[PDB]
């Protein structure tokens, strides 16, 4: 053709940040379980 | 040639200030996520 002459995004980012936080929590939990097993002998 | 003898700008500035605020909010949020991860072990 001729020469001529945001809220959703922010929300998506918030959802992503949330997911990352959940993943971090899951990881931390996994580490705690491993530590308890190691001390179990 | 011979010797002879504002609203849009303000709006643009407002948009800029807004963007800066959004950036600051994103940064603060990023810092919070980092702090939560550090405490996760």
């Amino acid at each position: 053709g001729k020469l001529t002459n945001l809220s959703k995004e922010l929300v998506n980012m918030i959802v992503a940040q949330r997911n990352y936080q959940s993943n971090a929590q899951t990881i931390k939990t996994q580490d705690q379980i491993l530590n308890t097993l190691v001390n179990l002998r | 040639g011979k010797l002879t003898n504002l609203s849009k700008e303000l709006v643009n500035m407002i948009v800029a200030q807004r963007n800066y605020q959004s950036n600051a909010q994103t940064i603060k949020t990023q810092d919070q996520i980092l702090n939560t991860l550090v405490n996760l072990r």
Binding site: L6, E9, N12, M13, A16, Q17, N19, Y20, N23, A24, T26, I27, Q30, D31 | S22, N23, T26
Partner: peptide, 24 residues
């Protein structure tokens, strides 16, 4: 499983960074 979770977290962080760059 832990390694996979870490990789997923890294991917999410990268996506967030990309989104921030796009917004900028």
């Amino acid at each position: 499983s832990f390694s996979q979770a870490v990789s997923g977290l890294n991917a999410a962080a990268t996506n967030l960074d990309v989104i921030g760059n796009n917004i900028a």
